[PDB]
Amino acid sequence: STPKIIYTLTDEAPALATYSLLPIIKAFTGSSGIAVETRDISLAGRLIATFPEYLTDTQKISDDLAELGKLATTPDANIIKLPNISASVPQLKAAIKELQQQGYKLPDYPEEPKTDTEKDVKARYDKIKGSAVNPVLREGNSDRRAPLSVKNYARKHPHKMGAWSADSKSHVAHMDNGDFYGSEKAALIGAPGSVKIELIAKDGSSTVLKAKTSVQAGEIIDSSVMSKNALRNFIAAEIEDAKKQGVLLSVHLKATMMKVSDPIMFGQIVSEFYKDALTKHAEVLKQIGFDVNNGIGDLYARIKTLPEAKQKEIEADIQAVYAQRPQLAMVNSDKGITNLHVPSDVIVDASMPAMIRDSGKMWGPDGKLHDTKAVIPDRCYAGVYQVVIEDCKQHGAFDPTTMGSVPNVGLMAQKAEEYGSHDKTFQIPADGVVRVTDESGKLLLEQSVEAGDIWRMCQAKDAPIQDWVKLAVNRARATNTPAVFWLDPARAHDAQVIAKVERYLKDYDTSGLDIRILSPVEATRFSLARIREGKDTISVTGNVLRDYLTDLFPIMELGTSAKMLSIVPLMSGGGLFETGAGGSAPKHVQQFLEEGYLRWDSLGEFLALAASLEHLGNAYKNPKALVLASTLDQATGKILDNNKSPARKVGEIDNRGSHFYLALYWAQALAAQTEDKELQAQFTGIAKALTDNETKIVGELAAAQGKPVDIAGYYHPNTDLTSKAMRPSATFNAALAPLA
Ligand SMILES: [Mn+2]
Numbered sequence: 001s002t003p004k005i006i007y008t009l010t011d012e013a014p015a016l017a018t019y020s021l022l023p024i025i026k027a028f029t030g031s032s033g034i035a036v037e038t039r040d041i042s043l044a045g046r047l048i049a050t051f052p053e054y055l056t057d058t059q060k061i062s063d064d065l066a067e068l069g070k071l072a073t074t075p076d077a078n079i080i081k082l083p084n085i086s087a088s089v090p091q092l093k094a095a096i097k098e099l100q101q102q103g104y105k106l107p108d109y110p111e112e113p114k115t116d117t118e119k120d121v122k123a124r125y126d127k128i129k130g131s132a133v134n135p136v137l138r139e140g141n142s143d144r145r146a147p148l149s150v151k152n153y154a155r156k157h158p159h160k161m162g163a164w165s166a167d168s169k170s171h172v173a174h175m176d177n178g179d180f181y182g183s184e185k186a187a188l189i190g191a192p193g194s195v196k197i198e199l200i201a202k203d204g205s206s207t208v209l210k211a212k213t214s215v216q217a218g219e220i221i222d223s224s225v226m227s228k229n230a231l232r233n234f235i236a237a238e239i240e241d242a243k244k245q246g247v248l249l250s251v252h253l254k255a256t257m258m259k260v261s262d263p264i265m266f267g268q269i270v271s272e273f274y275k276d277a278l279t280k281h282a283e284v285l286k287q288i289g290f291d292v293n294n295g296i297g298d299l300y301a302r303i304k305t306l307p308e309a310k311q312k313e314i315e316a317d318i319q320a321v322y323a324q325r326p327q328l329a330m331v332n333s334d335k336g337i338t339n340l341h342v343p344s345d346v347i348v349d350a351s352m353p354a355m356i357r358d359s360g361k362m363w364g365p366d367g368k369l370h371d372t373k374a375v376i377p378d379r380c381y382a383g384v385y386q387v388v389i390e391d392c393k394q395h396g397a398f399d400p401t402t403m404g405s406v407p408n409v410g411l412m413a414q415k416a417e418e419y420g421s422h423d424k425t426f427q428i429p430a431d432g433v434v435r436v437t438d439e440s441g442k443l444l445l446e447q448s449v450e451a452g453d454i455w456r457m458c459q460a461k462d463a464p465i466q467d468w469v470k471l472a473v474n475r476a477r478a479t480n481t482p483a484v485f486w487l488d489p490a491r492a493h494d495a496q497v498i499a500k501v502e503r504y505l506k507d508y509d510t511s512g513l514d515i516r517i518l519s520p521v522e523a524t525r526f527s528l529a530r531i532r533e534g535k536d537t538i539s540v541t542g543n544v545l546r547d548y549l550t551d552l553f554p555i556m557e558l559g560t561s562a563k564m565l566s567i568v569p570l571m572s573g574g575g576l577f578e579t580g581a582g583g584s585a586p587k588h589v590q591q592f593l594e595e596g597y598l599r600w601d602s603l604g605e606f607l608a609l610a611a612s613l614e615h616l617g618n619a620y621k622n623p624k625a626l627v628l629a630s631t632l633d634q635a636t637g638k639i640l641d642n643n644k645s646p647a648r649k650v651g652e653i654d655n656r657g658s659h660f661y662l663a664l665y666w667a668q669a670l671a672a673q674t675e676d677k678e679l680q681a682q683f684t685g686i687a688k689a690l691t692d693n694e695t696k697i698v699g700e701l702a703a704a705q706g707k708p709v710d711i712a713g714y715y716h717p718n719t720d721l722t723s724k725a726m727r728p729s730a731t732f733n734a735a736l737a738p739l740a
Contacts, residue, residue: 131257
């Protein structure tokens with residue numbers, strides 16, 4: 001019956017931080033009638049939950065991801081979601097190995113299943129790897145923006161911005177035709193039903209690609225195709241031009257999430273770039289099972305089984321290739337790891353803003369920065385980035401001390417658009433035409449295709465879209481800031497969305513508001529003009545642009561996309577608060593294990609918690625929760641103003657130290673506020689204890705630094721050892737003891 005806040009237990013860095021912060025949260029929220037429950041969505045937990053039949057009664061655990069998904073569609077849900085692993089196969093195997101060493105008899109991951117058991121096992125493991133969590137929890141749209149506190153702090157403490165030259169040779173390179181953008185076709189579903197996706201080959205034959213896909217009334221579905229011939233010709237031409245202009249060739253895709261389309265596109269780029277070597281050694285590469293879609297790094301891993309004489313020859317022919325091609329942007333120049341080694345190394349949402357901020361440059365083989373030709377094949381979003389680059393060439397770097405802000409209202413509920421296209425993406429087996437028909441046999445979408453092409457279909461439902469418009473009007477009204485819908489009338493999909501947006505906007509009183517619809521490129525130019533004059537503009541966009549813009553603007557404005565709000569007003573009425581948009585920082589864990597220092601910044605957790613408390617306070621009419629939220633806002637502001645966030649080496653406060661300061665400031669705020677006497681009385685002694693013991697506590701926390709830390713594991717560490725290491729201050733622990 002007590003109102004609950006679900007706190008996700010995740011992986012690596014945030015997981016460690018949670019052992020320190022969660023106890024604090026529980027202690028501060030207890031007296032206000034709030035309960036905090038955890039749900040395990042860690043890679044290891046999701047693996048264990050999936051194979052109960054291979055486990056002892058005591059090893060089994062509840063399937064918390066499924067539980068959360070159900071919760072996300074309930075009216076009173078209140079979830080705080082921290083960053084987590086979207087596992088690569090290597091991470092998956094590593095986690096499986098660790099668990100087996102711990103006694104969990106999980107089956108091995110079979111990369112090439114040849115038995116009923118292996119096939120069943122691989123299918124299940126495949127649903128666990130990759131971006132498995134977000135699609136389940138995101139049952140609402142996105143309200144992502146940096147808090148005013150963070151913006152104001154950035155304004156006063158400007159981060160470094162690479163200077164821009166009007167002579168910069170950097171730019172985005174995209175196809176002119178033959179891409180998804182140029183072939184998009186859409187249809188508006190009239191009534192409930194389902195569609196069939198079939199390939200009608202030239203040889204007359206027919207192949208069902210996906211027999212059934214349920215569709216709702218008012219749902220928008222669209223098909224598009226990336227032409228293999230056009231992509232290859234585009235790549236070949238850009239390779240030559242990069243070499244001619246003397247710039248680094250870089251590639252910006254979203255391989256981990258766009259698990260079907262992007263690795264294929266990545267592979268086609270790798271194939272054309274290294275064609276002389278790959279063709280020459282075609283037979284032996286097939287023999288060792290080389291998978292070009294997994295990058296050239298896959299070749300280096302698999303050739304280690306061939307005679308040393310062969311490895312030598314192959315590696316030499318690869319070097320001959322590099323001498324004939326333009327230089328590649330590097331992920332790690334010292335180790336010779338290029339942009340083409342691993343598909344998941346360079347991720348477009350973070351890589352493009354990083355490049356734009358750093359003078360439009362990337363690392364070259366020499367370990368220095370150089371201008372670059374950023375390849376983003378498809379035209380749908382490539383233009384947005386080009387506009388930013390041109391803006392910087394003409395106006396110079398952005399000025400964090402005066403620039404405005406561009407928050408985002410994004411459409412993502414129910415795996416909207418590209419995010420739910422994976423099971424409807426197919427590499428075409430043979431020339432023909434793909435047809436999408438409904439149950440009555442009506443032809444909804446028809447696309448001519450060639451063998452090797454990438455065909456895909458996306459879906460966008462009406463309820464998500466109406467809620468998305470509602471959210472946009474809400475934000476515009478709350479901030480009295482102009483809002484712009486980024487929709488391209490030339491795209492069949494966007495055109496269908498525009499029709500809905502124009503209709504739904506009429507469902508609101510927008511009299512004193514400034515709302516408009518512009519194509520992505522026009523929207524970008526409009527927003528950048530306003531941002532440089534210090535004005536704000538709300539970007540209202542689809543799922544992918546939500547992803548891109550919420551990394552892009554925070555990077556320019558704040559120098560980081562790790563300090564902000566990612567509020568998800570669940571369509572069922574609940575609230576989901578994501579603490580961070582990034583990864584779980586494996587490197588932070590490495591430093592912690594090596595020298596007992598955790599540099600993870602929990603600011604996002606503090607921000608999300610305040611939003612969660614406010615949500616609970618309003619939903620349950622709990623006055624104390626609202627006071628807890630207000631005082632936490634103050635404490636978080638002091639963390640920023642008094643510079644109590646983690647440092648980087650050893651000696652200074654780390655993640656644990658920042659949590660102490662949060663507790664200190666929060667308790668002090670609670671003891672001084674005049675809205676709730678019971679909380680004031682209760683936290684007076686707590687504030688005194690933390691205040692009087694600041695030096696002693698900070699010292700005990702610092703004493704836990706400087707030595708190796710062993711928590712008996714990585715993906716599934718011993719909880720007692722981890723808890724001990726993350727809560728080393730007996731004085732701090734004792735100070736919160738009275739809390740109930
Ligand atoms: Mn992102």
